[PDB]
From a paper:
Notably, KM was 5-fold lower than wild type for the proton donor-less [name]-HAT variant and the MINPP-like [name]-HAE double mutant. The low turnover numbers (kcat) for these hydrolysis-compromised variants (only ~0.1% of that seen for the wild-type enzyme) suggests that breakdown of the phosphohistidine intermediate is rate limiting. Of the remaining variants, [name]-HAE showed a marginally increased production of InsP5 [1/3-OH] (22% of the total InsP5), while [name]-HET proved to be more catalytically flexible producing almost equal amounts of InsP5 [1/3-OH] and InsP5 [4/6-OH]. At residue position 305, the [name] substitution found in the [name]-HDE and -HAE variants results in sidechain χ1 angles of 46° and 65°, respectively, for the glutamate residue. The residue therefore adopts the g− conformation rather than the preferred g+ conformation for glutamate observed in α-helical environments, which is seen in bacterial MINPPs for which crystal structures are available. The g+ rotamer is required for the carboxyl group of this residue to approach the phosphomonoester bridging oxygen in the specificity pocket A to allow it to function as a proton donor in catalysis. Thus, in the [name]-HAE and -HDE variants the E305 sidechain points away from the substrate and towards the active site cavity. The inability of E305 to participate in catalysis is reflected in the similarity of the kinetic parameters for [name]-HAE to those of the proton donor-less [name]-HAT variant and low turnover number for hydrolysis of phytate. [name]-HDE has slightly enlarged pockets A and B due to the loss of the side-chain methyl group of T305, whereas the double mutant [name]-HAE has larger pockets A and B with an overall change in polarity. For both variants, pocket F decreases in size and its polarity increases by virtue of introduction of the larger sidechain of and carboxyl group of glutamate.
[name], the [name] periplasmic phytase of clade 2 of the histidine phosphatase (HP2) family, has been well-characterized and successfully engineered for use as an animal feed supplement. The [name] periplasmic phytase, [name], is a 1D-6-phytase (EC 3.1.3.2) and initial hydrolysis preferentially liberates the phosphate at the 1D-6-position on the inositol ring. HP2Ps catalyse the hydrolysis of phytate via an obligatory phosphohistidine intermediate. The catalytic proton donor is found in a second, short, conserved motif with sequence HD positioned such that the aspartic acid residue functions as the consensus proton donor in the catalytic mechanism.
Residue numbers in the entry: 5 to 410
Amino acid sequence: ELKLESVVIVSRHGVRAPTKATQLMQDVTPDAWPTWPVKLGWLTPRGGELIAYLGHYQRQRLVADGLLAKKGCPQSGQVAIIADVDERTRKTGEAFAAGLAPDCAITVHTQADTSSPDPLFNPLKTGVCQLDNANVTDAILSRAGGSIADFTGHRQTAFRELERVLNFPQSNLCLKREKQDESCSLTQALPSELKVSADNVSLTGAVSLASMLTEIFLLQQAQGMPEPGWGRITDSHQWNTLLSLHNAQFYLLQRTPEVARSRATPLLDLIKTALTPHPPQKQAYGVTLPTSVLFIAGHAENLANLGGALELNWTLPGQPDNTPPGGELVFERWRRLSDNSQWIQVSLVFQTLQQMRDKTPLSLNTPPGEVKLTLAGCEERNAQGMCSLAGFTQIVNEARIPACSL
């Protein structure tokens, strides 16, 4: 009924070491954090291998869909790869290429200067545009339930789960509060406030600490470390409860449209240029678009920003992190044969946490998880839930912030 014409994959980088080692991380547990085999924030070898499995799976699926050849290397830019300048994203691009097309030496493009941020992955970071402080503050606080106190008050079960995994009551932070007649709870020992600036939004205290620590436990599990969370995380309900704190911070700071639309605008422009039929032309990064397959190696925020800007909602069965390492927002252009009309499908492809833990080789018979998505604002949908090309174009033009374009 339908023929696949084009695919754009926006991928988070693979498993990485923690990006920071702070004094507060030491003070909230009596135990020693496991050390990692690469520098802070770098991709691990295992993370690269997990990405290559997704590349291998995507080759098999795209061959089955008739888009790539079963044997040989894709020719003349049929496949293009763009990565953010960070080590972890560059090496994710290389790992994906190695799985998709081994020995084909597909180039991993970055911006010219790899020592400075690339605004494609967040235009606020180079000051292309700025957030509206009052609008962002009100929008985030409303999505939090009206205040950060309301937000943390409704999540005490998850904070107590994190405290148990940390053995928080025996930590230096708690032992000093016991000596000062103040009771030991993460949220009250580390009050959380929303900080909004022209170029960033963040949360302080327990909310951001919890978001980072629960991601570290997940990374430990995916890395195959023997005892993530000191062996105190023993079932799936516990994993889901812990990562709810991480996903909740992303819901506030990255999915909120008042942030997401600006942060996602350059990626929206690149996705639309890649998916829209037009005479091929070398554009950004020296990549010729449109082409058959474009893989973009970025960050968790990019997945969440695109989700918030485009009203794409999901949770990932079997994967506690809704923006997991190697997770892929996959945009596809399909041609309907009955009338040769053009349609856009979006899905979230991801390894389950168990597939990461077991280093499961992926294939058509053992596929990654996949969640089919719908653009909530699309008014022209086909029977398969895809948006018409014109409908998707209108949604993108409405969502994007022109001042944030490159």
